[PDB]
Amino acid sequence: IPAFHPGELNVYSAPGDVADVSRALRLTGRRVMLVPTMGALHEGHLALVRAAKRVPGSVVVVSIFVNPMQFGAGGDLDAYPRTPDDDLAQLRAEGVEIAFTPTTAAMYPDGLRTTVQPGPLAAELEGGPRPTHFAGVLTVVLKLLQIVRPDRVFFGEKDYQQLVLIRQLVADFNLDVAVVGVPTVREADGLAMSSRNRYLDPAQRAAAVALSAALTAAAHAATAGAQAALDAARAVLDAAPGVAVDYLELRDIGLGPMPLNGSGRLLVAARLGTTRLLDNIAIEIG
Amino acid sequence: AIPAFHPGELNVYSAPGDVADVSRALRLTGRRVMLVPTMGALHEGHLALVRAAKRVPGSVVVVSIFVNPMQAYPRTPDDDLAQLRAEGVEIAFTPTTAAMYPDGLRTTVQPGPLAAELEGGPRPTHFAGVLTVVLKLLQIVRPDRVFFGEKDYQQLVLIRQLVADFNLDVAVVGVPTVREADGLAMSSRNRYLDPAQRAAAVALSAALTAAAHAATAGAQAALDAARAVLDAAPGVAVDYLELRDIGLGPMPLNGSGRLLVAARLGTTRLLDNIAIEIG
Ligand SMILES: CC(C)(C)[C@@H](O)C(=O)NS(=O)(=O)OC[C@H]1O[C@@H](n2cnc3c(N)ncnc32)[C@H](O)[C@@H]1O
Numbered sequence: 001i002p003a004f005h006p007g008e009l010n011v012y013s014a015p016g017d018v019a020d021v022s023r024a025l026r027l028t029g030r031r032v033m034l035v036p037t038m039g040a041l042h043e044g045h046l047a048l049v050r051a052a053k054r055v056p057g058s059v060v061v062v063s064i065f066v067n068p069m070q071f072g073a074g075g076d077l078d079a080y081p082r083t084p085d086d087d088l089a090q091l092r093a094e095g096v097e098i099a100f101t102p103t104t105a106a107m108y109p110d111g112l113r114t115t116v117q118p119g120p121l122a123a124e125l126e127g128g129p130r131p132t133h134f135a136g137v138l139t140v141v142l143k144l145l146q147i148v149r150p151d152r153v154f155f156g157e158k159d160y161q162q163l164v165l166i167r168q169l170v171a172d173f174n175l176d177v178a179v180v181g182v183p184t185v186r187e188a189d190g191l192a193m194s195s196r197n198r199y200l201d202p203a204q205r206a207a208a209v210a211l212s213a214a215l216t217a218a219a220h221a222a223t224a225g226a227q228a229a230l231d232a233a234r235a236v237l238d239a240a241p242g243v244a245v246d247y248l249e250l251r252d253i254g255l256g257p258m259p260l261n262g263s264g265r266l267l268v269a270a271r272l273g274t275t276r277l278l279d280n281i282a283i284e285i286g
Numbered sequence: 287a288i289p290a291f292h293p294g295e296l297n298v299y300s301a302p303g304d305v306a307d308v309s310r311a312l313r314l315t316g317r318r319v320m321l322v323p324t325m326g327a328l329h330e331g332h333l334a335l336v337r338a339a340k341r342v343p344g345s346v347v348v349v350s351i352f353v354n355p356m357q358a359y360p361r362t363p364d365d366d367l368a369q370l371r372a373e374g375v376e377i378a379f380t381p382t383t384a385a386m387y388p389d390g391l392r393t394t395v396q397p398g399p400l401a402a403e404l405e406g407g408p409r410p411t412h413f414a415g416v417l418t419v420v421l422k423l424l425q426i427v428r429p430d431r432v433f434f435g436e437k438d439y440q441q442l443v444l445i446r447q448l449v450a451d452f453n454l455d456v457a458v459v460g461v462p463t464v465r466e467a468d469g470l471a472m473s474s475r476n477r478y479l480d481p482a483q484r485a486a487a488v489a490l491s492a493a494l495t496a497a498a499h500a501a502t503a504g505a506q507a508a509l510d511a512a513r514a515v516l517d518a519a520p521g522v523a524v525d526y527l528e529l530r531d532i533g534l535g536p537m538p539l540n541g542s543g544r545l546l547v548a549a550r551l552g553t554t555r556l557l558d559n560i561a562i563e564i565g
């Protein structure tokens with residue numbers, strides 16, 4: 001056990017350090033909350049932090065780790081935004097007591113050896129062109145969960161497929177953690193907050209409102225049925241200058257091997273220049 | 287409410303949630319939870335693991351009995367439970383397949399490359415099944431220590447890889463192989479051997495022990511000694527005979543290693559392995 005000062009941000013890099021502190025905290029009755037991130041923190045991440053913080057007796061651990069395993073080769077890893085100074089400043093301002101900032105060597109001392117193989121969902125949507133991406137995500141989240149052993153772990157609805165996959169991980173491996181989904185944080189015009197939004201120039205930023213406009217239009221059109229919802233979204237995306245749609249799909253809420261009934265999720269991915277944006281929304285049919 | 291637990295009696299649980307709750311409750315009361323994963327049909331080899339678990343001060347012993355479809359096998363539940371009662375084991379965990387896999391096979395563990403080697407030759411998905419079910423059992427029971435036999439050495443090493451790679455907070459304890467009077471490693475498969483096969487089967491252990499003593503003369507002497515012993519036996523189809531380092535990487539020039547053999551006698555496949563010190 002190393003030093004933990006309450007009411008202050010404590011930064012630990014060694015997995016053993018945070019594990020020891022987490023264990024000590026949990027044994028004195030504090031409930032440990034985990035918020036996994038890759039840093040470059042914005043208000044969307046802070047929504048998860050605040051959700052963690054309101055759990056009574058909670059101590060909040062925010063992990064910051066840009067996980068190489070979930071990146072495909074081709075510059076994405078090097079290009080991921082890194083603003084560590086701002087990140088830690090934001091955590092202090094939010095009254096977070098623990099930041100976990102491990103090294104790549106500490107997380108992957110043996111390279112890729114034992115890993116998590118996700119179910120068939122990982123091959124679809126985001127995983128279509130990136131068939132190893134979610135194995136990266138599930139592997140690192142499993143490790144983080146084992147290191148920190150939180151009572152609850154927090155994920156954004158922003159990455160809805162990721163959230164679904166984490167619930168599968170938790171169910172399928174009998175993990176003793178509650179997964180808390182947190183609603184998507186949006187800019188004033190509807191644009192879902194993302195560390196990638198910084199790559200939109202003013203014109204592309206203008207056009208990007210089309211993703212959330214399309215989804216919200218769909219959600220209201222859905223009283224008229226699925227075809228109406230999808231065609232409303234398509235019309236909006238089609239009206240938008242320089243938006244190239246990768247996919248627009250309406251699925252059951254579990255995204256799994258079940259047909260759409262009363263409750264669905266509409267998911268979109270689109271490119272604005274080289275920037276790929278995602279958004280999704282709850283859809284109720286009829 | 288925590289499920290009923292009767293100290294000093296064998297308490298049997300089939301629901302994962304029940305064993306999980308009892309385990310958590312017990313650890314809070316100052317017990318150290320010991321897990322011994324098995325597939326039932328228990329013999330003295332399995333009981334050696336039980337006895338290792340039992341001697342830890344403060345122990346409560348959890349023996350799981352579960353035939354993992356992912357990795358007909360003998361099934362004697364009444365008899366198994368009686369053996370555990372006779373050993374003073376307080377918890378048996380006996381889940382159904384549906385309880386262990388309520389959503390079928392979905393998220394699984396993918397082992398590292400060692401899983402494709404040795405036993406993974408004939409059964410390239412076997413260790414994925416093993417690591418998946420062991421990970422689940424570890425998360426359900428959350429033991430302080432988990433016990434595995436040196437009998438399945440490759441399994442044991444792979445479980446150490448699992449634990450290190452996923453940052454699992456459990457100590458893995460390897461338990462020495464229990465052997466019949468002539469050296470044959472104990473296994474439920476031994477009873478399938480006919481008299482001539484059973485007599486020939488002694489060559490696996492004889493070959494390994496000969497090798498371990500021949501090892502003062504170096505690695506090649508150790509291997510040649512083992513091959514000679516196996517070559518003296520009729521009807522023993524050697525699948526592999528390999529000297530590796532203790533983590534089953536390539537054998538160093540000197541130091542500690544493991545010699546592993548597998549062979550087929552008729553339709554029965556037998557395994558054995560032994561510690562080797564080179565020079
Ligand atoms: C292995 C990790 C799970 C750490 C990685 O894959 C990851 O997603 N990293 S992340 O830094 O991009 O996001 C961290 C968490 O913040 C969530 N998040 C992001 N933007 C928003 C938003 N606008 N509103 C609500 N929630 C949001 C996101 O869904 C995720 O759960």
Ligand SMILES: CC(C)(C)[C@@H](O)C(=O)NS(=O)(=O)OC[C@H]1O[C@@H](n2cnc3c(N)ncnc32)[C@H](O)[C@@H]1O
Pocket residue numbers: 323324325326330331332334335354357416419420433434435436437438441461462463464465471472473
């Ligand atoms: C997923 C499981 C780990 C439950 C499964 O793969 C398995 O190995 N099941 S098992 O019933 O075949 O073995 C249970 C345990 O007993 C151990 N074992 C068996 N025979 C001996 C022996 N003769 N001497 C010492 N130890 C022995 C074996 O290595 C394993 O750790």
